[PDB]
Structure formats: C-alpha cells, structure tokens
Design an enzyme around this catalytic site. Structure first.
Site, mmCIF file in Angstrom:
data_model
loop_
_atom_site.group_PDB
_atom_site.id
_atom_site.type_symbol
_atom_site.label_atom_id
_atom_site.label_comp_id
_atom_site.label_asym_id
_atom_site.label_seq_id
_atom_site.Cartn_x
_atom_site.Cartn_y
_atom_site.Cartn_z
ATOM 1 N N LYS A 46 70.619 53.803 33.646
ATOM 2 C CA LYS A 46 71.372 52.939 34.575
ATOM 3 C C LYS A 46 70.469 52.668 35.774
ATOM 4 C CE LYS A 46 75.708 51.403 34.605
ATOM 5 N NZ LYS A 46 76.174 50.756 33.315
ATOM 6 N N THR A 64 75.461 54.655 29.446
ATOM 7 C CA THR A 64 74.857 54.431 30.769
ATOM 8 C C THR A 64 75.954 54.503 31.862
ATOM 9 O OG1 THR A 64 75.029 52.010 30.753
ATOM 10 C CG2 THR A 64 73.015 52.979 29.715
ATOM 11 N N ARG A 83 38.701 39.957 63.757
ATOM 12 C CA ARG A 83 39.737 39.221 63.024
ATOM 13 C C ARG A 83 41.073 39.932 63.148
ATOM 14 N NH1 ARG A 83 38.867 40.790 56.526
ATOM 15 N NH2 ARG A 83 39.296 43.040 56.889
ATOM 16 N N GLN A 103 39.371 48.598 52.762
ATOM 17 C CA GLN A 103 38.903 49.715 51.909
ATOM 18 C C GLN A 103 38.550 50.946 52.779
ATOM 19 O OE1 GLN A 103 38.172 46.468 51.490
ATOM 20 N NE2 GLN A 103 37.647 45.987 49.341
ATOM 21 N N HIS A 151 46.533 37.114 55.222
ATOM 22 C CA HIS A 151 45.548 36.370 56.010
ATOM 23 C C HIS A 151 46.158 35.525 57.117
ATOM 24 C CE1 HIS A 151 42.833 37.746 52.982
ATOM 25 N NE2 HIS A 151 43.435 37.056 52.029
HETATM 26 O O1 LIG Z 1 38.935 43.987 54.237
HETATM 27 C C1 LIG Z 1 38.605 43.141 53.390
HETATM 28 N N1 LIG Z 1 38.281 43.601 52.158
HETATM 29 C C2 LIG Z 1 37.894 42.791 51.170
HETATM 30 O O2 LIG Z 1 37.608 43.208 50.033
HETATM 31 C C3 LIG Z 1 37.832 41.335 51.452
HETATM 32 N N2 LIG Z 1 37.488 40.266 50.726
HETATM 33 N N3 LIG Z 1 37.633 39.158 51.539
HETATM 34 N N4 LIG Z 1 38.061 39.552 52.792
HETATM 35 C C4 LIG Z 1 38.197 40.893 52.799
HETATM 36 N N5 LIG Z 1 38.600 41.808 53.716
HETATM 37 O O1 LIG Z 2 74.730 48.539 24.432
HETATM 38 C C1 LIG Z 2 74.972 49.493 25.189
HETATM 39 N N1 LIG Z 2 74.083 50.515 25.191
HETATM 40 C C2 LIG Z 2 74.243 51.601 25.949
HETATM 41 O O2 LIG Z 2 73.423 52.537 25.963
HETATM 42 C C3 LIG Z 2 75.443 51.668 26.821
HETATM 43 N N2 LIG Z 2 75.914 52.580 27.677
HETATM 44 N N3 LIG Z 2 77.089 52.077 28.202
HETATM 45 N N4 LIG Z 2 77.353 50.837 27.651
HETATM 46 C C4 LIG Z 2 76.367 50.534 26.783
HETATM 47 N N5 LIG Z 2 76.087 49.470 25.990
#
Ligand SMILES: O=c1[nH]c(=O)c2nn[nH]c2[nH]1
Ligand SMILES: O=c1[nH]c(=O)c2nn[nH]c2[nH]1
Ligand SMILES: O=c1[nH]c(=O)c2nn[nH]c2[nH]1
Ligand SMILES: O=c1[nH]c(=O)c2nn[nH]c2[nH]1
Ligand code: NA
Ligand code: NA
Ligand code: NA
Ligand code: NA
Lengths: 295, 295, 295, 295
Positions: free
Chosen positions: C10, C57, C176, C228, C256
C-alpha cells in the site's frame, strides 16, 4: 465592519457514475470533479457564530452523490443546472448556487477494431468543463468550456510587422513553430430555469463538439499572422454556428520553441531555413486573450 | 573518507526536432526530455577541487543538441545508444554514460478525415521512455518502457480468497472496478556496441507497439482474479513475442473506487448490484509489482 | 516464464498522530505518508491466481493505523522498524518488508514570543524520510534522508579550470550564484533486529540534526570550487561525526541563474561585476551525485 | 462579430535581483515571477491582422528586466505600479496594464546564531503577491495578498448547531482538528498615480506583516465556532489597523482529518476523547470565502 460578499461550500468532490445497458451489456462511465458554493442570508454565521444558517459542507457533498444517483450526469450543463436549482429551492435562505464541474475523459477502448463493452482509456488530460450560476429570480447562467487541449504546428505561422522601439529585440519571422494549450469558453444566453435548460439539452454536446472541431481545423489550416488573428477566426465561426451563444472567450499561451545556433561548432547550420533542432522553453510564455460577442 | 560512487551530468534537457520531406511536403516532429549522467575517473573533482577532469554539464547539453542535429532521434533506443557511445569514445577518462529519454506524444491531426501535413495534438500524457547504460568494455544495456497509460474497466474484475485475520476488514468481491496507471519496462539482452544496436533497429518500435497492444488487450479481456494475476499474463505474452527481451517488469497502482451507501437517505439503494455512483479515492493506493523472466 | 522478483503493498497512506500531555496541556502533532511493500512466498498469486498467500493491501493499511495507535511514531527510524518487523513475524510466508516514510513539518507556532500549546505551521516543504528494509534472517537496513531543502548563495561560488574542447561554450567564472535543492541520505550500519534499533534511538534525531547543520554551514561558508567539491566536504564531516553511518549520498541539482546582457538598451551594464538582474532557468539543470564511504 | 474585451502580454517571467552593500558586504536577494497584460486600442490585431498595434510580448519581457535594473523591486506594490505606469505612458494606444507579481521567499540563513551575509534558504512555499491594475485616467488599483500559509491546530475548534435535514450525516462536535491554507487579500483605496503610491511606500511592508501576524494570532487563540466565525475576526482586525484598506477577502479550504474507528480490532479505542490517530483527507475539502468591508 460588514460582510460585503460571502460564499462557501465543498470543492474537489470526485464522482464516478456507471450506466449499464441490460439488453446490450454495454457499460458507459462518467467521472467528474465537482465544486458547489452557496450564497444567501448567511452573514450571521460569520458575524455572530450563528451556525443555524449553515447547510454543512459535508451535506453539500452528500447532496452531490444523491443528485448523481437520481439524475443523468450528462450533459454536464444539465447536471449542474439540476444540482444548483436543488439548493435554491430546498433552502429558503439560500439564494444563489455556483456549480463548477470538470469532466475527465474515459474513452471506450477499441480492441481488434471493435468497441469494448466495459474498458476505457484516459486519452489525454483535455477536460470539458461547465460553470453554472443559479440565482433565485434571475435564472441560470451557463458557461461551457474545453481546456487542456495542447497542439503544435511546425510551419505556417508568421509574426512580422509589430511595433519596434528601443525595447525590441525580437526578429520578424515568416516561418515559426506555433504551440499552445487551448482554453475556450462559450457563454449561453441566460435561461429562465430548468425547463428551458431541458428544452435545449441536445445543443450542449453538439456545441462542445463544434467548438472543438472549429478550434482544431482553424488552427491547422490558418496561415497564421499572429495568435490574435487566428483565435479571432475561431471565435467568429463558433458564434456563427450557434445562435444561443452570446460570447466566446479564448485564452491561449504562446509556448515558445527557440532556434539553437550551432554555427560555433564546425560551422553547423541550424537556423532559419536550416533549423531542425529547437529548444522548447518552459517559461516565460506569451498569454493572449480575447472575448468576442455579437455586433 | 573515500568516493565510493559518483556520477554527474545534465537533466531536463528539452529537445524538439522536425523532419521535412521535401517531395511530399509532410513534416514530422519529435519532442523528448533527455538526461545524461557520466561516470569515470572523476574522483579528484570531488576530493581535490580538480576541475580538469570535468566535462562541463553545459557541454553535455551542447552535445545533446549537436548529436540530435547529426543523427536520427528515433527510435529512442538508437538515439540514446549513439549519445552514450559518444561520451565514452570521446573522453578517455569517462567510462560509463547513463542516458534517460522521455518521448512526448505529438500525434498528427486528422482534419476532415485526412492526415494533416504539419499539425499535431498531444493525445495524452502517456510516455515512451528509454534508459541506456553504455559501459566501456561491457557493451550497451537498454531498458525500454511505457508509462502514464491510465485505464479503467467497470466490471470483470474480482478479488476474493485472500488471507483473513484480525487485521482484515476488506469484503470479498466478485464484481469491482479496476483502474490503474500502467508502467511497463522490458529489458533487452546486452548489446556488444552500436553496430549490434543498429542491426536490431526495426525491433524497437515493433516491440513497443506489441507491449502496448498486449497490455490493453489483456486488461480488457481478462476476467481478472487480481492485479497480480492479470499483470503476469501480460508479461508472459510479451516475453513470448520477442526473444531479444530478457525480462519484463510491471508496476501498477490499484486506484480504488469505493461504493457509497446511500441507504440512510430514503432507503436509496447504491451498493452491490445496485451500485451506480462511486467515490474515486485519491489515496491511499495499492501498488503491485512483478518482474518476469525466462525459465 | 518465471517470477524473478515480486513485491506489493500500500502506498500513500497518510497518517496523523497527536500526543496530549495531560499535565502541561501541551499537544504535539506528527504527520507522515507511509508506503509498505512486502516480499515472500507469493509467486502463486501471480502465476496460479492463488489469493490465499495475499495479505490484502487494505489490511496493510489497517496495520499501519493500528501500529501507529500502539507505538511511538518518532523517530521515524524506530517506527519503520517496528512496522516492518511486524509483517515478517506475523506472517510465516512473508520474508521481507520495505517501509518508506515521509515526515511532513508541523512546527509549533510562536505567538507573542511564546510557544503555543496546540497550533502549528508548515514551515517549508523540506521532508525528513526513512527507508527501512526488514529482511528475515538478515536484520534491518535503514537509510535516513532529508530532501526538499532549497538554498541559494549569491556569491562565493566559482567554476573554472574545467575541460575545454570543441563542445564547450561555457565561460570560466570566479563569481556566480549557486542554488540547489538538497537531497542527502545516510545509510546506517546493518542492525540485528528491533532490540538493537531501540538501543540506538537517541542517535537518530541527533544525526538528522547534525546532517542538516553540516549541510547548511558548509554550503554557506565554503568558497566553492564546484558543486562536486562542496558536497564532498559535507559528506566527509557527517561521516566523521557519526560512526554508525556507513555511507553518505548527496544528489544536488545545480539550478542556473543566467546573466542578462542589457547593453543593447542604452548601453545598460548588467554583466560581470555590474550584474544585478538575472533570469532564473527552470530547465535544464546540472545534476551532481556522490556516495562517500569510509577508507 | 465584435471584440468585446482583449488583453495580451507575457506570463511566468522569472526575475532575480541582488543588492550589494559595498560598506558592510551584506547582500540581499529578491526573486519574483511576473505577469504583465496590456489593454488598449489593439482590436485590429485580432480582426485585420494588423500587427502594428502590438507591443511584442518579447518586448514586454525585456521591459520587465530593464525596469528591475533601474528601480527598486521592493515593496512589490511599488515595483508593479512603476512597471504598469511605464506601459500606459510610453504607448499612446495602450490604456491599461495589469501586473501580477508573486514574491518567493529567500530568507537569510543564521549560521552559529549570526545572520550570514550572502546565503539564503527557502523557508516555505508561502508567497507574498500583488495585483496592480494601472488604468489611464482612473489611477492605480492595488490588491496585496499572502497565500500558501498552511496551519493546523489540534484542538480548540468546534462545529455544532448547523442545519440538520434529510441530507445531513455530519455529527456535531466540540473538539476537532482545524487545518487550512490561508489565502488573504487586502485591497487598497484607489491611488491617483505613482506619486501617491510612493508617498505610502512604508505602509506596504507594514500592512503585509500586520495581516500575517493577525492571521496567525487569531487562528491560534480563537476557540473557533466555525471557519466562518474565525475568518471574520481576522478580517475585522486588519481593517481596524490600516485605514487605507477598503476590503479584506479570505479564501480558506477546510482540510479534513477524519477519526479512525479501530474498535473492530481488539476493542481498540480511537474515537472521541480517545482519538489519537487520524486519516488526513486529500479531497474533498470545504471552501469558505468572505469579503469584509467598512460599514
Ligand atoms: O559546479 C559545477 N559543476 C559542474 O560539473 C558544472 N558543469 N557546468 N557548470 C558546472 N558547475
Ligand atoms: O488485486 C488486488 N490485489 C491485492 O493485492 C489487493 N489487496 N487489496 N485489494 C487488492 N486487489
Ligand atoms: O467550519 C466549518 N464550516 C462549515 O461550513 C462546515 N460544514 N461542514 N463542516 C464545517 N466546518
Ligand atoms: O502571435 C504572437 N503574438 C504576439 O503578441 C507576440 N509577441 N511576441 N511574439 C508574438 N507572437
Ligand atoms: Na432559496
Ligand atoms: Na572512455
Ligand atoms: Na515471516
Ligand atoms: Na497610453
């Protein structure tokens, strides 16, 4: 201080309904998101903590499900009108209901070239919407729309002859990409009440289909002088084809695709007539709007 | 401390390319979002501030546009392999390139029942994706996928006979709505290099189409015992139809639609056989995954 | 065909818990989103439609609420370990549980310079997360993380001395803007089971706080030679301060901000030393990752 | 057909500006997203493809950057007024400018209990916004707002005494969780032009701060009878503290947290006075609005 305006209700109410044809076995699904806001003599809930005037928003939610159970949910113009009318008739002190509905696409699947009885696909996030305002003594005002229709044409768009001054860097062009997300709204003449809306029921689906078709055809076929000029042609045709529409509004982003100059790299030619690779721009975007009505 | 793993590059590089048939006048567009991450002898950029080993991410961006200008961009499996190979061949100290591509739909418009030469619609947010890992001396590993395919069937889904204990409240059912967003990935046998990828080029589009068709048909036609059982049938068929696939993985949310008991209101019947109006649930959701390979 | 891997459960289970100090009147809230996926002898649910092996579920959802009712939910490393252990102990055929928890911020409000007993604010979308894998016979593996921490410094970042070739257009710079969204993960040494996790409970909150503080201080104080180099300094310090961590991973977008040349307009000077107005770029973005471990 | 209304311009223009104090070395950053839409005698661009009346949206973008370079960008009420005034004065045929600005938070970092000269954190997605309408001959109308302020209180909220009828299932309560995202807008009296806006410059930041403080204090301290009653108290206080405001509007979602009955499981008590674990509901949500003005 005084309450100048107030409205309240329930938003984002998701509803699904299925219809089962017992004869043919064919099933049809509808899914919508609904918002209902009410107005009326409710000021004291704000000013005096008087909750007696409040139809709880949870009850509004229940009402939407009950109304969907007991009435057709299509066309959404009819469903919204039924839902809005309910509130003003049921509650003496409520005098306006504002209903917004967003319809989600569930398109029947074709498997091996035949329509499947009960399986569906969401083909695109395009929506069909309605806004219905039901005002006691003033009838029903309906605005219908389509939104989220995204299109692109790779040529047959131009933009030249605009104002040039000391703020202008944009080059004139006779061939560019045009791409937009279409939001189009048509506003119906005011209806006197539910009987009148019911009398026009077949026009709602037909006009939506016409609006869509006119939009797509005009976009594809217009040798466009600007977004402004092309959108005007669309609105003009819709108004010509449905006399019960009073106005048509379009709101169109202009989603830019920029040329990339690659000439710095081994003289590679990628601009003007040689442009093949472009950089779509997420922002900013042009935004162009127009409301067109009758002479 | 030591660098155990490192990779770096450029993400979210949007690319559009147009092809213009000079004879027929027909134009075809492709739009993708690309990510390229590199690995190699680059530890000193982290540990000693030695930038001499860094191919700037801005240069990676330029490379993507240049490569798109000079090569076909379809099928994406081929484009990704060309792009990844470039980096490991061009730079002695770079030993792996990881390329992810998301392909966006631009479907040719039909206007009056004929295909338009240069106008397109985004029909749905479904994507076709590839992940290509090009590793010096170990060839090219390609995973292809489709994602964002949203489907619903309104009947012919069951779920009963599951484990019941003191944590269980779920009722068994013989008729429910089943809806999911499909994420399906097929992993190709390792390729020795670009020549081998080129030799299989026609299989890439065909296998994507087969995967899509099998998914849709099986979903629509299976009287489903569970999501688990239905997804297994899909994966089984894909593996049967393409011998160059080693594994198929499905990851499927189970998007719940709940019955609404309205019996509190005038005995209204809206459950079991009488269920017509349902409440789609935004969360939580089941999540079911499986990887299927060969015996 | 054969099932090579399978897991199900779920996702997106939202949980809120309140603690009420009866003496002081002070209330403390926790809100989380939880995902639990199980693995074990469940292949037949896929291959033979055998639902008898499936813990529904929906039952998994119930279990999460019951476990939250009966146990502390903080630190999330402990809660996830309790929840995962439950499934492998309760069900003979379930042999691994994978628990992901996202913790949402609800920070106590200060009103007039004093902490309010029961009112809270969401100060930022920064999250604290855990991934807990509980595997029968192999103990408990915990990865803790912070994500969604967005920072910017307007000077004291440089980038020069990178590889220049025929693909390079980027100018070297000694001043920058540097801005990123920080995703940092620290992986704990394997724990033998719940008793051992309980014995280390105080270290979890303390190490999260240390990771956050080291990240912020290093970012603010480093005269950065590259993303980096700066990220490596962060990871080095975290490993030095907590011996029970085996590895630290950082994944950092480089968001950017571009200079805007305005010299075309009345010789306006807005580049290099005169740069005051910049255009933030939504995409593309650099993506830089590193995993640092012990010598 | 006729053009009834038209406006066009540039949306989503991201702008960053830095101020550098040469004496102290302290740097201060501002980041905004700006939209400018113009109106005037531009109908012929729609109806006759006459581009001569169009100030290109690309030029509008340039203008925003140039104006930011040459003027202060804070308070946003002043910047928007300068920007809007520019268009109506520069272009004879443009008669209204509509400027929307969203201000993003960049909060100075405290490192070791001292404010850092040039490093910032995005503490929350709360925004400060303005809408400025500059209309030739009718002055400048300014609406200021805060949005995206998300709060929760775990007790001291009640909701009882609402209308009960055949649509009502909601139980009255004297103790519930209240959580909302606050959207508050205050509308200034009309200003005659830029000189008058400049004369009130100090009031803009002060009133934003007051609106925020009143919102938070009232929410935390009110033993709330309803969302309606609490929001009215907020608006009342803001109007009392700033005579140049004409109206205050609040729009508040009511984000529901539902009790979970666990009594089916070993008689576990988790409702009413024993409620500890709740399920936050993503949808639907109440939506409550009010506009408060002067007697
Ligand atoms: O910090 C940066 N890392 C990068 O790899 C990069 N490539 N273009 N500008 C950038 N600035
Ligand atoms: O098709 C379903 N599968 C499940 O596992 C399920 N669990 N509740 N309702 C459901 N319906
Ligand atoms: O504060 C509230 N106001 C309302 O109008 C309402 N309706 N249901 N619950 C509610 N809570
Ligand atoms: O179609 C367009 N309309 C416009 O107003 C505009 N402004 N720049 N580019 C443009 N394209
Ligand atoms: Na009424
Ligand atoms: Na190499
Ligand atoms: Na077990
Ligand atoms: Na003017």
């Amino acid at each position: 201080s005084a309450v100048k305006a107030a409205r309240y209700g329930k938003d984002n109410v998701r509803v699904y309904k299925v219809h089962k044809d017992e004869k043919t076995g064919v099933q049809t699904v509808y899914e919508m998101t609904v918002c209902v806001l009410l107005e009326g003599e409710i000021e004291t809930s704000y000013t005096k903590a008087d909750n007696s005037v409040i139809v709880a928003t949870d009850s509004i939610k229940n009402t939407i499900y009950i109304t969907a159970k007991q009435n057709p949910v299509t066309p959404p113009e009819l469903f919204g009108s039924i839902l809005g009318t309910h509130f003003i008739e049921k509650y003496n002190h409520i005098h306006a209901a504002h209903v917004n509905i967003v319809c989600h696409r569930w398109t029947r699947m074709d498997i091996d070239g035949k329509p499947h009885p009960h399986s569906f696909i969401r083909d695109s996030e395009e929506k069909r919407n309605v806004q219905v305002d039901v005002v006691e003594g003033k009838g029903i005002d309906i605005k219908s729309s389509l939104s989220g229709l995204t299109v692109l044409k790779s040529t047959n768009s131009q933009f030249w002859g605009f104002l040039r001054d000391e703020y202008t860097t944009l080059k004139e062009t006779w061939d560019r990409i045009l791409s937009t997300d279409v939001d189009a709204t048509w506003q119906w003449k005011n209806f006197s009440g539910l009987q009148e809306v019911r009398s026009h029921v077949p026009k709602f689906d037909a006009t939506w289909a016409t609006a869509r078709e006119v939009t797509l055809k005009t976009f594809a076929e217009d040798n466009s002088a600007s977004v402004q000029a092309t959108m005007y042609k669309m609105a003009e045709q819709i108004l010509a084809r449905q006399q019960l529409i009073e106005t048509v509004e379009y709101s169109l982003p202009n989603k830019h695709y920029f040329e990339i100059d690659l000439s710095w790299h081994k003289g590679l030619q990628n601009t003007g007539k040689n442009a093949e690779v472009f950089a779509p721009q997420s922002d900013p975007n042009g935004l162009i709007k127009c409301t067109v009505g009758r002479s």
